[PDB]
Amino acid sequence: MSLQHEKVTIAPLVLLSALDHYERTQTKENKRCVGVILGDANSSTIRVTNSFALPFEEDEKNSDVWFLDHNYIENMNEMCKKINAKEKLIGWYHSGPKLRASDLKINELFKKYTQNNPLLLIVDVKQQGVGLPTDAYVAIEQVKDDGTSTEKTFLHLPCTIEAEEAEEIGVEHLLRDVRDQAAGGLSIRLTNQLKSLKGLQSKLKDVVEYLDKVINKELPINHTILGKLQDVFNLLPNLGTPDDDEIDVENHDRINISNNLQKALTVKTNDELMVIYISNLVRSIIAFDDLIENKIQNKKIQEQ
Amino acid sequence: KLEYPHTDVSSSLEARYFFYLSKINAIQLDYSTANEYIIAAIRKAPHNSKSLGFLQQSNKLHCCIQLLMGDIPELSFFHQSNMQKSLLPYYHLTKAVKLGDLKKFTSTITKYKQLLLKDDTYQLCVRLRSNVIKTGIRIISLTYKKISLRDICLKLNLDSEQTVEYMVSRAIRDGVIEAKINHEDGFIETTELLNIYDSEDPQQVFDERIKFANQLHDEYLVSMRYPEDKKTQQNEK
């Protein structure tokens, strides 16, 4: 037991494997690919190193019916310790994108192969999101506030793709595209800055909609969200304080340095111009010489 | 009409054109732009002794334009010019305007009335009569920040306390002296103190310098590859 899952690093091996595995069972139409994920666990950083399918069925008539083969999980463990003992079961991927309550009960099962709470790694294989190709959640059991019972629930814990070093080599090989976002030159980051504003703006739009549905359509108040929003209003920049004024002075400080640099280049660019005109000057003379030199050549043929 | 060509001309031609624009713009009371063309007219023009009329008359005209602004051309401009003999009237006017004396300005123009009439700089000088007063109170603004009305009248020999207020109002409308009068309280209080890196005005100054640098970055590029084309196309030894 430990509640340690604060950062989830994903190897790119896991996201492409989940892409294959969905298609090697051929699940569709809110049928799911449930397999295991292995890695290291019982630790502050989880590294999700590997993924495998398991036998699994998903019934659409009742979501409390699914199949799972237990004997498969025991036999796969024996094998993987021989390849690598740094690999152990750390929880399960689920194809998603929809998280359900019956998935808490699948969760309980996986809590009998790993000491830590199992990690349920939602990998969207349908590629509907333009960001989040990983969202990670861990089941924890806690008394929920506002007269509410003890609920078993899936809380979001930070995840990011970071890649192993051994993985990296192949990531470099398969990416031969120009990369619209890669953090390049002036050009690459002006495309980014625009992209970044529409990113945030849409994220902000979900918050508006959510809030409306709480008091219109009576969504359950989840006071965690609402607490975070109090701090949103409390970290708002307020104008007319000496801080904002110093920031406008700093925009001139920075543009000041940009101006000196721009002049310095104007001398390089003019240096290049000067140097071509010298070449062209010479070339006028060389072309003139050919005309004289012909006469000298013609005269020899006649003589000899 | 605005179709003057820069396409397949000489620089002398450009120098000629700019000189005419300066005269028109200066008398239509837009000295800022008249000055900016006359500096360019001199630059674009070749500098030689067969170019001496142009050089002499464009240096004369430029200085008349600075006095019209309220600026003083450099003393050093006149002394280190090797045309210092004919810039004898102009050394005198630049001095008369600086010192602010009304008496000196009248006296100087009376001699060199003819001299100024030749070069078409007499027209400028009629309005430099106005400009004497303005310079003299620019000195007063820089020395003294609070100065009673009477004290100004004693220095500058002005007739009444009411009169000098009218003159200062005209000037502070145009925003040169940048002062503000207190009529009731019987003083004039200079309001200039600058401190403008605290305003957003340096962003606008920076817009021009980047814009200026940009102008050369296009110009080199287009011209440079142009001679090279012919030379490869043509035979070589």
Descriptive notes:
Chain B: Residues 15-195 form the PCI domain. Chain B: It comes from Saccharomyces cerevisiae (strain ATCC 204508 / S288c) (Baker's yeast). Chain B: This is 26S proteasome regulatory subunit RPN3. This is part of a larger assembly, with chains A (304 residues) and B (237 residues). Chain A has 304 residues and is an alpha/beta fold. Chain A contains seven helices and ten strands. Chain A has helices spanning 12-23, 70-83, 103-107, 165-174, 186-216, 223-232, 242-303; strands at 7-10, 34-40, 45-53, 56-58, 66-68, 88-94, 119-122, 135-143, 150-156, 159-161. In chain A, the strands form two sheets. An eight-stranded mixed beta sheet of chain A has the order 9-8-7-6-2-3-1-10. A two-stranded antiparallel ribbon of chain A has the order 4-5. The radius of gyration of chain A is 32 Å and the shape is elongated. Chain B is built from twelve helices and three strands; from the N terminus they run H-H-H-H-H-H-H-H-H-E-H-H-E-E-H. Chain B is globular and about 85 Å long. The A-B interface holds A 245, 248-249, 251-252, 255-256, 258-259, 262-263, 265-266, 269-270, 272-273, 276-277, 279-280, 283-284, 286-287, 289-290, 293 and B 197-198, 200, 202-203, 206, 209-210, 213, 216-217, 220-221, 223-224, 227-228, 231, 234-237.
List the helices and strands and how they pair.
The structure is cut from a larger assembly and holds chains A (304 residues) and B (237 residues).
Chain A: E1 7-10, H1 12-23, E2 34-40, E3 45-53, E4 56-58, E5 66-68, H2 70-83, E6 88-94, H3 103-107, E7 119-122, E8 135-143, E9 150-156, E10 159-161, H4 165-174, H5 186-216, H6 223-232, H7 242-303
Parallel strand pairs in A: 1-3, 1-10, 6-7
Antiparallel strand pairs in A: 2-3, 2-6, 4-5, 7-8, 8-9
Chain B: H1 11-27, H2 31-44, H3 52-69, H4 75-80, H5 88-99, H6 102-111, H7 113-119, H8 122-126, H9 128-143, E1 146-147, H10 149-156, H11 161-174, E2 179-182, E3 187-190, H12 201-233
Antiparallel strand pairs in B: 1-3, 2-3
Helix pairs in contact in B: 1-2, 2-3, 5-6, 5-9
Function (chain A): Acts as a regulatory subunit of the 26S proteasome which is involved in the ATP-dependent degradation of ubiquitinated proteins.
Keywords (chain A): Acetylation, Phosphoprotein, Proteasome
Domain MPN (chain A): 8-143
